[PDB]
Amino acid sequence: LYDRRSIFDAVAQSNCQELESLLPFLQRSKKRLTDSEFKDPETGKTCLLKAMLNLHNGQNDTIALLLDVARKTD
Secondary structure, eight states, X not given: OOOHHHHHHHHHHTOTGGGTTHHHHHHHHTOOTTSTTTSOTTTOOOHHHHXXXXXXXXXXXXXXXXXXXXXXXX
């Protein structure tokens, strides 16, 4: 299972293994990664913007993971 806080912490730490089950989670739940559950309630930022603001040596492997998940889901 996943929620906004878990995804945000995973992309902040750049742990791709925590996000391995994100695609089947979304496909079983039948809800989009762009839905309001995953945006911040106040700023409106999404997990991609959280990932982009946390780069280590100019790298963050979770960005491609999120883009592929967004491609595959809806």
